[PDB]
Design an enzyme around this catalytic site. Sequence first.
Site, PDB file in Angstrom:
ATOM      1  N   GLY A   1     -14.477  60.792  -2.211  1.00 32.05           N
ATOM      2  CA  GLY A   1     -15.006  59.559  -2.786  1.00 32.05           C
ATOM      3  C   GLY A   1     -15.389  59.730  -4.240  1.00 32.05           C
ATOM      4  O   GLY A   1     -16.151  60.636  -4.584  1.00 32.05           O
TER       5      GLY A   1
ATOM      6  N   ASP B   1     -23.549  51.959  -3.792  1.00 36.22           N
ATOM      7  CA  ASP B   1     -22.294  52.229  -3.066  1.00 36.22           C
ATOM      8  C   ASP B   1     -22.500  52.128  -1.542  1.00 36.22           C
ATOM      9  O   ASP B   1     -21.921  52.886  -0.768  1.00 36.22           O
ATOM     10  CB  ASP B   1     -21.767  53.620  -3.470  1.00 36.22           C
ATOM     11  CG  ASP B   1     -20.304  53.847  -3.117  1.00 36.22           C
ATOM     12  OD1 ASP B   1     -19.537  52.877  -2.911  1.00 36.22           O
ATOM     13  OD2 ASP B   1     -19.918  55.035  -3.049  1.00 36.22           O
TER      14      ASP B   1
END
Length: 293
Positions: free
Chosen positions: A20, A138
């Site tokens: 990520g 996020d």
Amino acid sequence: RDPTQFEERHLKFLQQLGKGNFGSVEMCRYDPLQDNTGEVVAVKKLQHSTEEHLRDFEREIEILKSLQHDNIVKYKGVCYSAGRRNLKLIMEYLPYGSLRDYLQKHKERIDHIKLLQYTSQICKGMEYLGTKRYIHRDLATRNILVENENRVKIGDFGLTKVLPQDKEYYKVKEPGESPIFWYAPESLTESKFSVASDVWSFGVVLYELFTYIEKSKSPPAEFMRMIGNDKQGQMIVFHLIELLKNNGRLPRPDGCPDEIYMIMTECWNNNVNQRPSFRDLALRVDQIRDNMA
Ligand SMILES: Nc1n[nH]c2ccc(Br)cc12
């Protein structure tokens, strides 16, 4: 010997766990006796360990290290490399993997009672985070991990920012890769991130959960449909901003209870100050669970 000081030489690669933004995560055995009996841990490292990335990664590590909550992945320690000082973050390994994969795998075999248990836990992790004046930025099911059938934990803090002493938002000056389909309007237009924009993203997580990660129903799929699949690059952001301004929203997931749908829609308020608090959301979700049970 320090348990939070791990020698990289003793870490044995087992499998890859995820990638990520800037970091990659691997499942490793910390095996100093070299007989395969050591503890299995999750290890986060940088793909491109530049000066600037290393600086940001070290702040991320300090963020995680400062958090102690049942619904936040546990910090275990750090690896330091000789010379250029590359860093690895050592964390507990949560064996059931990401909530996104877990739900996509078992689908409706996870009932509403279970989904609301996860919702409450995510809410509580976020509420705690907010007490430290951290902004996650996020929040998505791909960044939530499953410990076991009964417990989830917020699992990644790669975009997490600390609020300035005197401001209730953090402004990002040069945005990197941005999860725009989870972003509040003011994050898209002004790059402002706050507890209230995390609440917006939490509404999107709630949506994710109740769609059971059906691919055609993902927030990117649905928003792209609403703005037109012909939109590309920077035009996606332009049309998304216009859509949201005109109260375009993700639809109610099929079979979603109205009380849960109501929570999503409240999180998705254009008016920042009108979005619910995580303290109130945790109370409301727990009451809904109580009524169902
Ligand atoms: N499966 C996992 N266990 N612990 C983790 C920490 C970060 C990430 Br990404 C994944 C895991």
